[PDB]
Amino acid sequence: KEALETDLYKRFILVLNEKKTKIRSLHNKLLNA
């Protein structure tokens, strides 16, 4: 149970970090246009 939970949470936070980087880039480029 612990292994499954930690693996799933690690994958999910990795995906969330990637999406947050993308949205941050979108916000940064929104200002210029």
Partner 1 sequence: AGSENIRVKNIILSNKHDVVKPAWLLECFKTKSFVPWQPRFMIHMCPSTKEHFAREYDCYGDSYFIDTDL
Which residues contribute to the site for partner 1 (CB under 8 A)?
Answer: 9, 13, 15-20, 22-24, 27
Is there binding between residue 33 and a second copy (CB under 8 A)?
yes
What separation, in Å, do the N-terminal and C-terminal C-alpha atoms of the chain show? 48
d(CA 33, CA 29): 7
**Minimum separation from the CB atom of position 30 to partner 1 (A):** 12
**Minimum separation from the CB atom of position 10 to a second copy (A):** 13
Is there binding between residue 15 and a second copy (CB under 8 A)?
yes
- CA angle (25, 29, 33) in 5-degree steps: 160
